[PDB]
């Protein structure tokens, strides 16, 4: 190809705290609209914000997990705009002086092998509410208003629709691994906004940028980008100039579309929120979070290859879906036959659970039961053929392998 | 200062100015802006913006606090429906 | 005659059962009925409700057991309207208590009404109440000051003994001066701003009006301390001010800023202030000239900062969750812009326009940011002057109470009322306005600005001054 795709992404990750960012209302999915609510998050007259400590602690854990420099001083700014799901007229985030800066995420590619996407910033902000349209009216649930979010911004380092997806997947996995957000786009805990230009290959200056807002799955971002890149390429070789705008993506058509409303944005009138003193983060606290950091995926991936002699294909499976690795490790602990357990987990148990629709967190076969089953295969008590028969029923029922060996004879 | 200026700032601020206000605010503000231009004279390179003295950023444990009763929370609403605030549709 | 009695007199009567809370309220109620038609201190009188609340009031040893207290109508009292004297908030029923109201209620106090003000605390005369002017009980052709106009006035006529206002740039002190009453704005952070409708978050403070220094010291002590619902409230112990005002500290020093000599004063005010200082000199205060090289910049600084924070704090009045909403609109933009144009008064609209400009990118550095830096220079002048001196004195106001319509022609003329009051708010310092003379029938206030957290000294000097000069005995309407 003559061109090159330059992709940058803007992710808003919802932090898994119990409490909102600036008040003690609960964060929880579901239900009753305007239920977990406040003078404060309702942006009522006279209501003041108060910083959630965990949100901060999770926002630091996440920055570090992303190799960001965490700044000891950062400042909440007011970000002004009028919209029904924004109770105050402003959103409290961070502007100049964000929490974290100069980080990076590492990608593992089908094969260029190994690549880096830089994190431009990670800032702390609060969420808006949701709107529902119904007739000539919009209905506003401010339950989600004020929810803690990390806004994460990438450098234009991504080059490929797939890399865009691989990025989001890895980001998700770190978040989950650090345990700061559930980060499933399905549940509304990860939003992503896409920025795309093209150059001609090897040129060092940037092309006109299009923004694609509100794509809702990792698959959809890849698709949106896939189309959009072809779209711009068409425009440029036809002799036209690619116009800088926002666009939208229809899942059903797989296409990206300009907007009827010709609405330019407005000055956010940023300035520090005088209801809040600057966030001073002690170095001792960072060190403490750094020292007690959970195990991250890139580290887990190397540890398993060593501690259990798994293959890069085996460990990948187990690390990308954390709960499987968690399962695997509890099982190997019951019976230290690692090669055997991974075989029966990947080749057998996983496929069987997928077929019912049951996730590994909730499987009837507990790590104990698989380690037990594998044990009878090693100690030659049953055959591989019968082992494959008792596993189908282990899942079918919930019984131990040695329950059904007896019950059916051997 | 121009009519265009008064409108642009009103738009940002969401005040549909009445024609009487566009004339009156053209003068008053033009004056007020001349009235407050007194600070150039002063040198503030090497001066820190004002903030009150704190030692530590005051924070707050992650523990739920009883929300506002939904009833009180909507009672002042200009229009309510089914637990929701209602507004004209947004596009 | 009961409403003519101080809180010490009322408390002793209440503690020994000689009077009941209900009688106390009834007394002030009648005085309200005497005066209100002329004065117009209140937006929402609550004597009726207070009457009922008094019947259930029993524990007499509560610090404010049976005391009526008026409250500015930008402080939320739950179940009752909080209008901020605005069309955009008439019919807004307050869903929660401001922290100060909570603390007063717990102290046995009885909220007797919601007091008139300039709309959104924005003004220096109360003329910008969207409902009606309050009038000066010493001359009803004259303004009572602002923005806490009603709170000062009702304390002057004694339709309530003691009062709550707020002070962003002098909105307790200047009404105190004009109405011939004591009014204190404490250190920034000393009193919670939870439930105070925000004007300028970094300048606002709730404060107290009274006629006796002990009244003021007590109400301030109660309403006082750290509040977990307020990030900017300080984790500092509240001094026992009721036990402290009566004490006397030797060899205190008073600074007179050289730069204030250049300030245009009315001769009567000048004369009043000179006498105030001579008389304090006689009592053993050392009087020193100090320098505050940046103070003259106070007013420009304030009138960038205040309107900026105000445009931000007022973005929430939008017709969506509460308050006024315009009747005619074709789209949510019109709903917004019409609700606001119709619901906001003219002074509020002026500061909103100014604010959104001062915060606009391209002008932010030269306006808001600049101002916040000049503010530090200003603060520093004070800190340095406090190395040599213990309090700083000046007139509270450059003029005697002025006439209605006198400062409505050019909005700037209204701003110039604040020249002596704003520096305290910029620096975050406590300041008190104290009645020092009556000149041509009209109150004159003397101002003392103290060090951070030194409300004590401010109160002590106010207590000593009232012994020499018993302003609490002047009552306006018969
Ligand atoms: N020419 C471009 N092509 C692709 N992405 C870009 C380009 N310029 C900026 N971006 C991306 O846009 C995202 C958001 O940029 P940001 O500066 O936060 O918002 P804005 O540019 O609107 O102020 C970042 O991911 C950045 O990498
Ligand atoms: Mn954002
Ligand atoms: Mn963008
Ligand atoms: Zn809340």
Q: Could you tell me which residues come within 8 angstroms of residue A28 by beta carbon, excluding any fewer than 6 positions away?
A: A36
Burial of C155 (0-12, 13-18, 19+ CB in 10 A): buried
CA angle (C165 as vertex; C160, C166 as ends), nearest 5: 180
Beta bridge partners of A116: A106
Of A374, A372, A368, give the one whose Cα is nearest residue A327: A368
Residue A334 neighbours by CB distance under 10 Å: 17
CATH code of the domain in which C241 resides: 3.90.1300.10
> H-helix or E-strand containing C391?
strand C391-395
Beta bridge partners of A6: A197
**Do C403 and C439 touch, CB atoms closer than 8 A?**
no
Q: Could you tell me which residues come within 8 angstroms of residue C120 by beta carbon, excluding any fewer than 6 positions away?
A: C74, C84, C85, C86, C197, C199, C310, C314, C345, C348
Residue C217 in tokens: 């010291």
Residue C451 neighbours by CB distance under 10 Å: 20
Helix (H, G, I), strand (E, B) or coil at C67: coil
Alpha-carbon distance of A40 to A77, in angstroms, equals 17
Of C386, C477, C399, C369, give the one whose Cα is nearest residue C430: C386
Q: How far is the CA of A192 from the centre of ligand 3 (A)?
A: 10
Residue A263 neighbours by CB distance under 10 Å: 9
Domain ranges of chain B: 1-43, 44-91
Residue linked to tokens 């003041």: A48
Closest Cα in chain A, distance from residue B5 (Å): 14
C331-349 burial, b for 16+ CB within 10 Å, e for fewer?
Answer: ebeebbbbbbbbbbbbbbb
Closest residue in chain C to residue A86, using alpha carbons only: C316
Beta bridge partners of C432: C184, C448
Alpha-carbon distance of A163 to A154, in angstroms, equals 13
Of A23, A65, A28, A70, give the one whose Cα is nearest residue A172: A65
Residue nearest to atom 4 of ligand 1 (CA): A196
**Do C183 and C171 touch, CB atoms closer than 8 A?**
no
Alpha-carbon distance of A61 to A175, in angstroms, equals 9
In testing the pocket of ligand 1, which one of A101, A164, A191, A209 has its CB within 8 Å of the most ligand atoms?
A209
C314-327 burial, b for 16+ CB within 10 Å, e for fewer?
Answer: bbbbbbbbbbbbbe
Q: Residue C149 — left, alpha, or beta (φ > 0 → left; ψ -120 to 50 → alpha)?
A: alpha
Residue C252 neighbours by CB distance under 10 Å: 18
Alpha-carbon distance of B75 to B80, in angstroms, equals 9
Closest Cα in chain A, distance from residue B19 (Å): 23
Burial of A370 (0-12, 13-18, 19+ CB in 10 A): buried
Of C429, C421, C450, C445, give the one whose Cα is nearest residue C263: C421
**Do C231 and B54 touch, CB atoms closer than 8 A?**
no
Q: By what method was this entry solved? A: X-ray
Kindly report the CATH number that applies to the domain delimited by B1-43: 1.10.20.60
After which residues does chain B become discontinuous at a C–N distance over 2.5 Å?
none
Helix (H, G, I), strand (E, B) or coil at C20: coil
| Size of chain C, expressed as the number of residues it contains | 478
Burial of A188 (0-12, 13-18, 19+ CB in 10 A): middle
Pocket of ligand 1 (CB under 6 A): A 6-10, 153-156, 195-197, 206-207, 209
**CB pairs A-C closer than 8 Å:** 101
User: Neighbouring chains of A at 3+ CB pairs within 8 Å?
Assistant: B, C
**Do C27 and C2 touch, CB atoms closer than 8 A?**
yes
A50 interaction partners in chain C (CB closer than 8 Å): 228-231
Of A145, A11, A10, A137, give the one whose Cα is nearest residue A90: A145
Report the catalytic residues of C: 72, 147, 171
C376 contacts B49? CB cut-off 8 A = yes
Alpha-carbon distance of C50 to C47, in angstroms, equals 5
CA angle (C201 as vertex; C197, C202 as ends), nearest 5: 155
Distances (CA, A) of A320 to A127, A183, A300, A304: 28, 14, 10, 13
HSE-up of residue C201 (Cα within 13 Å, Cβ side): 26
Residue C91 — φ and ψ, nearest 5°? 80, 0
Domains contained in chain C, number: 1
C331 interaction partners in chain B (CB closer than 8 Å): 88
Alpha-carbon distance of C77 to C69, in angstroms, equals 12
**What distance lies between CA A35 and its chain's CA centroid?**
27
Instruction: Kindly list the strands in the beta sheet with C182-185, ordered across the sheet, starting from the edge strand earlier in the chain.
Output: C42-45, C110-115, C68-72, C163-166, C206-210, C182-185, C431-439, C442-450, C391-395, C253-257, C286-290
Of C400, C323, C437, give the one whose Cα is nearest residue C141: C400
Alpha-carbon distance of B40 to B30, in angstroms, equals 17
Residue C256 neighbours by CB distance under 10 Å: 16
Residue nearest to atom 17 of ligand 1 (CA): A153
CA angle (A383 as vertex; A378, A387 as ends), nearest 5: 85
The DSSP string of C296-318 is: GGHHHHHHHHHHHHHHHHTTT-S
Alpha-carbon distance of C409 to C402, in angstroms, equals 14
Ligand number nearest to the C-alpha of A191: 2
Residue C412 in tokens: 């700037």
Residue among A45, A84, A270 whose CB faces C320 most closely: A84
**Do A25 and A38 touch, CB atoms closer than 8 A?**
yes
B60 contacts A52? CB cut-off 8 A = yes
Closest Cα in chain C, distance from residue A209 (Å): 22
A45 contacts C360? CB cut-off 8 A = no
Sign of CA dihedral B26, B29, B31, B33: negative
B24 interaction partners in chain C (CB closer than 8 Å): 346
Q: Tell me the three-class secondary structure of chain A, residue by residue.
A: CCEEEEEEEEEEEECCCCECCCCCCECCCCCCCCCCCCCCCCCCCCCCCCEEHHHHHHHHHHHHHCCCEECCEECEEEEECCCCCCCCCEEEEECCCCCEEEEEEEEECCCCCEEEEEEEEEEEEECCCEEEEECCEEEEECCCCCCEEEEEEECCCECCHHHHHHHHHHHHHHHHHHCCCCCCCCCCCEEEEEEEEEEECCCCCCCCCEEEEEECCHHHHHHHHHHHHHHHHHHHHCCCCCCCCEEEEECCCCEEECCCCCCCCCCCCCEECCCCCCEECCHHHHHHHHHCCCCCHHHHHHHHHHHCCCCHHHHHHHHHCHHHHHHHHHHHHHCCCHHHHHHHHHHHHHHHHHHHCCCHHHCCCCHHHHHHHHHHHHCCCCCHHHHHHHHHHHHHCCCCHHHHHHHHCC
Strand pairing class (C391-395; C253-257):
parallel
User: Neighbouring chains of B at 3+ CB pairs within 8 Å?
Assistant: A, C
Alpha-carbon distance of A272 to A252, in angstroms, equals 43
After which residues does chain A become discontinuous at a C–N distance over 2.5 Å?
none
Of A52, A18, A22, give the one whose Cα is nearest residue A40: A22
Of A106, A187, A117, give the one whose Cα is nearest residue A152: A117
- For ligand 1, what atom is nearest to the CA of residue A10? 25
- For ligand 1, what atom is nearest to the CA of residue A195? 5
**Do A228 and A256 touch, CB atoms closer than 8 A?**
yes
Closest residue in chain A to residue C358, using alpha carbons only: A269
Alpha-carbon distance of C74 to A113, in angstroms, equals 63
Cis, peptide link before residue C147, omega less than 30° from 0: yes
Interface of B with C in 60-79 (CB under 8 A): 60, 68, 72-73, 75-79
**Do B85 and C320 touch, CB atoms closer than 8 A?**
yes
Residue C262 in tokens: 């250049």
Of C298, C283, C277, give the one whose Cα is nearest residue C444: C277
In testing the pocket of ligand 1, which one of A118, A156, A160 has its CB within 8 Å of the most ligand atoms?
A156
> H-helix or E-strand containing B11?
helix B3-13
Resolution of this entry, Å: 3.0
Q: Which domain holds residue C6?
A: 1-478
Q: Could you tell me which residues come within 8 angstroms of residue C136 by beta carbon, excluding any fewer than 6 positions away?
A: C142, C143, C144, C145, C153, C178, C179, C401, C442
Beta bridge partners of C209: C163, C183
**Do C147 and C451 touch, CB atoms closer than 8 A?**
no
A82 contacts C315? CB cut-off 8 A = yes
Q: How far is the CA of B86 from the centre of ligand 2 (A)?
A: 24
The DSSP string of C173-238 is: HHHHHHHT-EEEE--TTSS--TTBPPS-TTT--EEEEESSHHHHHHHHHHT-S--TT-TTS---PP
Alpha-carbon distance of A238 to A364, in angstroms, equals 59
Residue C177 — φ and ψ, nearest 5°? -65, -50
Residue A374 neighbours by CB distance under 10 Å: 25
Ligand number nearest to the C-alpha of A124: 2
**Do B86 and B79 touch, CB atoms closer than 8 A?**
yes
> H-helix or E-strand containing C105?
helix C99-106
Ligand number nearest to the C-alpha of A246: 3
Closest residue in chain C to residue B35, using alpha carbons only: C300
Sign of CA dihedral A132, A137, A142, A143: negative
In C, what residues contact A, Cβ < 8 A? Answer: 75-76, 82, 84, 89, 92, 95-96, 98, 193-198, 200-202, 228-232, 308-309, 311-312, 314-318, 320-322, 332, 336, 356, 359-361, 364, 368-369
């Amino acid at each position: 190809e003559k061109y090159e795709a330059v992709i940058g992404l803007e992710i808003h990750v919802q932090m898994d705290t119990k409490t909102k960012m600036f008040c003690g209302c609960k964060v929880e999915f579901g239900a009753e609209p305007n239920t977990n609510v406040c003078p404060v998050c309702l942006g009522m007259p006279g209501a003041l914000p108060i910083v959630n400590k965990r949100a901060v602690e999770y926002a630091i854990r996440a920055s570090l997990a992303l190799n960001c420099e965490v700044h000891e001083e950062s400042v909440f700014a007011r970000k002004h705009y009028f919209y029904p799901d924004l109770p105050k007229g402003y959103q409290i985030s961070q502007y100049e002086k964000p929490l974290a800066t100069n980080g990076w995420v590492e990608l593992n590619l089908p094969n260029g092998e190994k690549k880096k996407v830089r994190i431009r910033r990670l800032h702390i902000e609060e969420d808006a509410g949701k709107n529902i349209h119904e007739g000539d009216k919009t209905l506003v649930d401010l339950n989600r208003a004020g929810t803690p979010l990390m806004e994460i911004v990438t450098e234009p380092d991504i080059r490929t629709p797939e890399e865009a997806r691989l990025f989001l997947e890895k980001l998700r996995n770190i978040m989950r691994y650090a345990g700061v957000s559930k980060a499933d786009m399905e549940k509304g805990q990860l939003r992503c906004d896409i920025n795309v230009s093209i150059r001609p290959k090897g040129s060092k200056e940037f092309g006109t940028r299009v923004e694609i807002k509100n794509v809702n799955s990792f698959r959809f971002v890849q698709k949106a980008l896939e189309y959009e890149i072809e779209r711009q390429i068409n425009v440029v070789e036809e002799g036209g100039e690619v116009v800088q705008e926002t666009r939208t993506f229809d899942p059903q058509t797989g296409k990206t579309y300009p907007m009827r409303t010709k609405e330019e944005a407005e000055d956010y009138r940023y300035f520090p929120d005088p209801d809040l003193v600057p966030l001073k983060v002690k170095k001792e606290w960072i060190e403490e979070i750094k020292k007690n950091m959970p195990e991250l995926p890139d580290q887990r991936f190397e540890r398993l290859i060593k501690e259990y002699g798994l293959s890069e294909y085996e460990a990948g499976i187990l690390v990308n879906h954390k709960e499987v690795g968690d399962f695997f490790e509890e099982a190997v602990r019951h019976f230290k036959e690692p090669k055997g357990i991974v075989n029966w987990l990947i080749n057998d148990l996983l496929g069987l659970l997928r077929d019912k629709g049951i996730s590994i967190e909730e499987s009837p076969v507990k790590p104990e039961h698989l380690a037990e089953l594998v044990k009878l295969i090693k100690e030659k008590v049953i055959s591989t053929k019968i082992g494959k028969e008792v596993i189908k029923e282990m899942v079918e029922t919930g019984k131990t392998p040695s329950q059904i060996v007896e019950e059916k004879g051997l | 200062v121009d009519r265009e200026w008064v409108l642009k700032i009103a738009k940002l601020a969401r005040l549909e100015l009445k024609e009487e206000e566009i004339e009156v605010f053209q003068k008053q503000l033009s004056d007020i802006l001349d009235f407050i231009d007194q600070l150039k004279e002063l040198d503030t390179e090497n001066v820190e913006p004002y903030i009150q003295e704190f030692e530590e950023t005051p924070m707050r444990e992650d523990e739920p606090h009883p929300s506002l009763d939904r009833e009180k929370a909507l009672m002042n609403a200009p229009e309510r429906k089914d637990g929701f605030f209602v507004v004209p549709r947004v596009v | 005659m009961l409403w003519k009695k101080s809180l010490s007199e009322l408390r002793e009567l209440l503690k020994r059962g000689e009077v009941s809370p209900k009688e106390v309220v009834e007394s002030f109620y009648d005085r309200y009925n005497q005066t209100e038609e002329k004065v117009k201190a209140y937006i929402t009188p609550l004597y009726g409700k207070a009457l009922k609340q008094a019947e259930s009031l029993k524990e007499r040893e509560l610090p404010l057991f049976g005391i009526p207290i008026a409250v500015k109508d930008n402080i939320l009292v739950e179940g009752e309207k909080t209008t901020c004297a605005s069309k955009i908030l008439e019919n807004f029923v307050a869903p929660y208590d401001a922290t100060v109201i909570e603390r007063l209620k717990k102290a046995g106090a009885l909220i007797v009404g919601k007091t008139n003000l300039d709309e959104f605390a924005m003004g220096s005369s109360t003329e910008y109440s969207a409902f009606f002017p309050t009038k000066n009980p010493w001359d009803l052709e004259r303004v009572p000051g602002g923005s806490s106009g009603g709170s000062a006035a009702s304390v002057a006529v004694l339709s309530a003994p003691v009062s709550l206002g707020s002070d962003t740039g002098g909105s307790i002190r200047q009404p105190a001066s004009f109405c011939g009453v004591i009014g204190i704005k404490p250190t920034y952070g000393r009193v919670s701003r939870y439930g105070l409708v925000a004007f300028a978050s970094s300048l606002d403070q709730i404060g107290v009006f009274g006629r006796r220094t002990e009244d003021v010291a007590l109400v301030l002590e109660v309403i006082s301390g750290w509040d977990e619902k307020d990030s900017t409230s300080a984790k500092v112990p509240v001094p026992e001010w009721s036990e402290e005002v009566k004490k006397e500290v030797k060899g205190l020093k008073i600074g007179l800023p050289k730069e204030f000599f250049e300030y245009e004063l009315q001769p009567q005010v000048k004369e009043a202030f000179e006498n105030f200082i001579k008389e304090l000199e006689k009592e053993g205060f050392e009087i020193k000239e100090v320098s505050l090289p940046h103070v003259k910049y106070s007013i420009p600084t304030y009138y960038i900062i205040a309107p900026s924070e105000a445009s931000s704090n007022l973005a929430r009045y939008d017709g969506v969750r509460y308050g006024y909403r315009a009747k005619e609109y074709k789209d949510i933009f019109e709903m917004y812009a019409r609700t606001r144009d119709e619901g906001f008064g003219p002074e509020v609209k002026r500061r909103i326009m100014l604010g959104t400009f001062a915060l606009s990118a391209g002008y932010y550095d030269a306006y808001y940011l600049k101002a916040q830096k000049v503010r530090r220079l200003i603060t520093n002048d004070f800190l340095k002057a406090f190395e040599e001196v213990d309090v700083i004195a000046s007139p509270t106001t450059p003029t005697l109470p002025f006439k209605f319509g006198e400062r409505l022609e050019n909005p700037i003329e209204m701003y110039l009322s604040d020249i002596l009051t704003v520096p305290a708010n910029l620096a975050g310092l406590p300041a008190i306005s104290i009645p020092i003379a009556w000149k041509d029938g009209l109150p004159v206030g003397g101002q003392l600005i103290g060090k951070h957290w030194d409300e004590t000294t401010l109160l002590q000097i106010s207590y000593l001054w009232e012994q020499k000069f018993k302003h609490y005995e002047k009552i306006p309407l018969t």
